[PDB]
Symmetry: D2
Subunit: 328 residues, 4 copies
């Protein structure tokens, strides 16, 4: 998984992710209107939305749970895989705001209008490993939260503390912890976006074979660490050199570089791990953009075309049918 935040040339804020998994989670694009009561059946925990919500998720036991999404106030949140280093409590901790793993994303979007509000609420928060239904284990997760101010935070629950990091890199992947990846960036201070055309090796003259010699050393595999490095520097380069031309498609160009391709990232169960979808949320405008591995055309769902005071959850079918423009 790879999360990305980017500001457009027009001062708007994009936030989204690659979804990298080997299976379907019966996903659909889910819209939840304001003041909507969401009730879980296995437990008795209830949630009423303050703000209208739009994102990718699934309806499990009539209850919505999200992979990534936005609200009407321009707050975005994405849940990304976080194995090994995560640690949830088994039960609710007395004196803390206890949030079940499966519900954290919705809890953020339904209740808060900004990263600042979320940061304050998370000070006394605790993420609990409570099943959504039956005995079903929760996915190991960490979250990236971003809003219209351009500020992003990273939420990671460890054994010692629920950590909330200021994210000044604009990216997130998977394990290890966020501060590890931040420290790892320091290894690549010698990278250059500008071409190195020549090198005089004493009595031998060396000449650049093609463009891109400055970035030699950039890791090209699909591990969380390597992907973090790649997107961090691709994002940096475009902000440095092309701030005034950043638009929607650029977001997809960055994430395409770290997208997994069928066949080459094989699990222990002999399945291909691939980038199933790429989402991009235009936070100010309430538009959820996404494409999929099967259909690369960007699809747009605009929450502002909905009745925000509506009385029903609305879903939209996950598009897996390649859309081609037949010119002639």
């Amino acid at each position: 998984c790879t999360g990305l935040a980017l500001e457009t040339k027009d001062g708007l804020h994009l936030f989204g992710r690659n979804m990298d998994i080997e299976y379907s989670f019966n996903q659909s694009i889910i819209f939840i209107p304001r003041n909507f009561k969401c009730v879980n059946k296995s437990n008795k925990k209830e949630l009423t939305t303050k703000y209208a919500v739009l994102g990718m998720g699934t309806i499990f036991d009539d209850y919505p749970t999200f992979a990534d999404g936005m609200n009407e106030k321009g707050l975005g949140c994405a849940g990304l895989n976080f194995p090994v280093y995560v640690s949830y409590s088994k039960e609710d901790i007395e004196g803390k705001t206890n949030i079940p793993v499966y519900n954290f994303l919705l809890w953020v979007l339904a209740n808060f209008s900004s990263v600042e509000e979320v940061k304050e609420a998370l000070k006394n928060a605790n993420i609990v490993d409570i099943p959504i239904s039956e005995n079903i284990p929760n996915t190991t997760l960490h979250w990236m939260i971003s809003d219209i101010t351009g500020k992003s935070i990273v939420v990671e629950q460890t054994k010692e503390k629920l950590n909330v990091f200021d994210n000044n890199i604009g990216v997130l992947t998977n394990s290890p912890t966020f501060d590890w990846h931040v420290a790892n960036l320091n290894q690549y201070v010698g990278l250059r976006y500008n071409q190195v055309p020549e090198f005089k090796l004493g009595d031998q003259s060396l000449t650049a074979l093609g463009q891109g010699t400055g970035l030699v050393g950039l890791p090209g595999d699909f591990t969380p660490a390597s992907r973090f490095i790649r997107v961090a520097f691709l994002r940096d380069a475009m902000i440095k050199n092309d701030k005034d031309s950043i638009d929607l498609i650029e977001f997809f160009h960055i994430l395409n570089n770290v997208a997994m391709v069928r066949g080459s990232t094989r699990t222990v169960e002999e399945k291909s791990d691939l980038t199933q979808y790429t989402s991009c949320m235009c936070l100010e405008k309430g538009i959820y953009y996404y494409n999929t591995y099967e259909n690369n055309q960007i699809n747009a769902i605009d929450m502002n075309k909905e009745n925000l005071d509506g009385n029903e959850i609305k879903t939209y079918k996950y598009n897996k049918t390649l859309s081609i423009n037949h010119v002639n």
Copy 2:
């Protein structure tokens, strides 16, 4: 530049390329019907097409010159940048079939129905540095040619000889010579597509942080050598593990991994080198598919919808307008 050949699950043959340049060459999709007379003005050299042709190129002095394209018989050819190691003759060489650099691609597509025919004709061929007009220098090039048999060849003119390589890798990039890249592949025999979940480092247990640990060592930069390695192995992995599911979109997934992103591949003239377009030719069906940096939706031009016995060159506008599916 990156060229790719791929066979689909249905036994059809895809051939295409990423176009990686920092400028526009006034490109359009160009269709040339059968028995069409193409005349160059600066010189008096003439060409009459035996087969109908469809591809990306430009009309320079009313004369068409191509970046990549196909003919009605399922033969495809792409011209890719080849600096330093290339060497064209200044004048026509007596006793040889002399082909001007700018005309080589059209010469292949207009005259021959197969790689086998092309191979035979190239035995006595010579590529000459003759200007298309005035004093204008030709681009340093090498070519990949592929047909419906699934065979591909690489054409590289050096000082000593016009080299024709059998391409069993299914890919091409830029400099150095093709045999160099073939030998370079041997360095990466230790790559694995299958996950390496653990390593016992004596008294320390090491655990995979995420998926993709087998490919650690894969180069992630945008140099011709690194891109060649990446596409060679991405292609191999998908053929090995997913032969029966290869379709059109998979071709784009492979090439997306080596596509240049705005800002990070900067020329000496402080311009961004980017993947301007990606083309994919369905050789059997005569369909030219392509998308662009600005518009990622795949566009299709089917030469079989044209009158192949037509009397005029037809062009189609290079699509740079992002095409979004507005769901609601």
Copy 3:
């Protein structure tokens, strides 16, 4: 800097380091006998040795301070550069065992007989930035401590806490923190010591060009992170495959791989950072072995040849004169 601990085929324990600096620190091999009173002049802080000590250090204002060393009980300690992530207190912290930076190494060796004793004493310890003389700033440091049990620990003072890590890797370099390097090891789970002779790339057969194809991906630069990875895996491979043949020279072979070479690691002040010396302590036998950049022959100083109840500090001249065996 690189620290290493290794057990020999005969069950003895080697501990030592590469000293990687661009300057001389007026070093000599320093022996301090038992019950010897060491007094610092700028402050009034005094130290009386419980155990006899032998190592590399310098006499600054008649007061000894060490780079690395051992005591008569088989306890070894090395101080290695630790910039950025270190944080010493400005003054003594009330209720804690306050140790000046420059004195920490001697404090360990003079007082304690084992890693276990040191671990217990460090629970309430604090490292303070007190000048050795005048206003002179202390070097940013972290320490590796090892004994005859084969156990090693790493001591790192941060803002929050004095951290004591169990070192199961057997190595140490520089920044970042120890736990960062431990987590970084996980990236290289795909490394193999055994040759990969071939790879079948579909229609192309790939063959290993030479030995060592399994380790492709190992970083070859001289940064702390890369050096940590290299020595960790070189050590692991030899323990795995050659446990019963490990001897003194093997220790040097491992460290030679991460030794800096004149000219290629240049500081901002245009000086060559090099491996000035390599020390190896045979902990059981009280022998300090070392060579230097100028003289690669191993020199041995045996503390047991000294009077351990002696009344004077003894020093031995740092050997920088290449020692050659003239055969004929």
Copy 4:
């Protein structure tokens, strides 16, 4: 295997190699005087030395064959492993100077006084796969030749031609061909010896963790290609920055970086491939210097202490006994 040529601060010329093998070849240091008749028994081929010779080799059937060596005129030659790309003739080729593989090194040293003389003689030369005895296959080899002018050449016999390359890099390893490695150097034009202390990643400040950030991207494994890159750049850096301080020990420092360490380079037969010895020839002075994996002290054999008009081959025992300087 790694070959290296280096000029000292005093204008003298060093030439030598790492011997990287998993076995002993019953090696000794062999001196052959002038006008000495060497006769092979299996065939009837004879060789009379014009110049006195000194190097590492073995006496096989009373006949000397060399791994590397020098003559009295300051000409040096080393044979290095060259699998796959080599191709010797089965029989003598009519009209050519036919040299058996096992005899090539001695043929160079015994007959010629300079690289220039050797270059001229090799124009009509052919290397033949004739057994030294019985049916025993020859080792796949290529050679580096160097003299007191500071010029080096590389000799590689392929199917098409006996290739003689001018070596302006000062190094050699193994497969692929020399021109491949020369072209491979171009990939690393972005390497820097000077520290990169900082990088401003937008809103995140990145700081060098330690020295050596400029060389990030240098390959750290033990394959021929990676070793070639490392020594080429280590040599370049020292000539660039430390020309006036290059001496004997520097030669060893460079080669130590690419020396194989027991346990980590394992063959298919589960044996450790290691750097068995490192030789360095002071060409002007006729001194053969070497150390071994077991004994790192440099040993010196001076051919000028011998009777060059002597009547017997003299050998010196390969030193595998660690030589330590006991200081006290």
